[PDB]
Design an enzyme around this catalytic site. Structure first.
Site, short mmCIF file in Angstrom:
data_model
loop_
_atom_site.label_atom_id
_atom_site.label_comp_id
_atom_site.label_asym_id
_atom_site.label_seq_id
_atom_site.Cartn_x
_atom_site.Cartn_y
_atom_site.Cartn_z
N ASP A 1 -16.20 -51.44 -23.29
CA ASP A 1 -17.66 -50.44 -23.07
C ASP A 1 -17.53 -48.55 -23.22
O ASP A 1 -18.08 -48.32 -23.63
CB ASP A 1 -19.04 -50.83 -22.34
CG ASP A 1 -19.64 -52.08 -22.54
OD1 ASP A 1 -20.16 -52.33 -23.35
OD2 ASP A 1 -19.79 -53.24 -21.46
N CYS B 1 1.74 -57.68 -30.11
CA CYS B 1 1.62 -58.65 -31.32
C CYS B 1 1.11 -57.89 -31.88
O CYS B 1 -0.23 -58.23 -31.77
CB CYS B 1 2.19 -59.86 -30.57
SG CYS B 1 2.60 -61.05 -32.19
#
Length: 172
Positions: free
Chosen positions: A75, A107
């Protein structure tokens, strides 16, 4: 069980040019921590940029004793490009101080933030906009829309923009 395997984890990817190299791997799992430190560190040791939700920040770093930047998305996640500038300084210092080292990253085989970060880090090797866009283009990167191309464009200096004529006039 004895000699059978299942599931298909994302495959790693190493990006290297000239002398230095990069590593693209998946974030640490909960079933094999040690196995990861060994392989991740196996390739080499340098700064690591993992941009994902933080689950095990200590386990992987403390086990591999490698320097890493923690980039999370919550947030209160800083959306401005300045964040990149932060990881840039981290890698920049580790790059100039450690020529041709071994870096580890999240990744990029899917969609995320690590891919941009990696390219920007390799940018320090000269071909900033050229290497980042070229090396990142070859490898699968997150969803690059505005920020990546606009940010990097500004990331690279251009004499065409710094063209000032001796004799000129000013009013407004």
């Amino acid at each position: 069980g004895s000699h059978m395997a299942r599931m298909n984890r994302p495959a790693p990817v190493e990006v290297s040019y000239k002398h230095m190299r990069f590593l693209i791997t998946h974030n640490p799992t909960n079933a094999t921590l040690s196995t990861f430190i060994e392989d991740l560190k196996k390739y080499g040791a340098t700064t690591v940029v993992r941009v994902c939700e933080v689950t095990y920040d200590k386990t992987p770093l403390e086990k591999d004793g490698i320097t890493v930047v923690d980039w999370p998305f919550d947030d209160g996640a800083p959306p401005p490009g300045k964040v990149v500038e932060d990881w840039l300084s981290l890698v920049k210092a580790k790059f100039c101080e450690a020529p041709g080292s071994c870096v580890a990253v999240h990744c990029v085989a899917g969609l995320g933030r690590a891919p941009v970060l990696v390219a920007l880090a390799l940018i320090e090797s000269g071909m900033k906009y050229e290497d980042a866009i070229q090396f990142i283009r070859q490898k699968r990167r997150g969803a690059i829309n505005s920020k990546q191309l606009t940010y990097l464009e500004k990331y690279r200096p251009k004499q065409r923009l710094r063209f000032k004529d001796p004799h000129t006039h000013k009013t407004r």
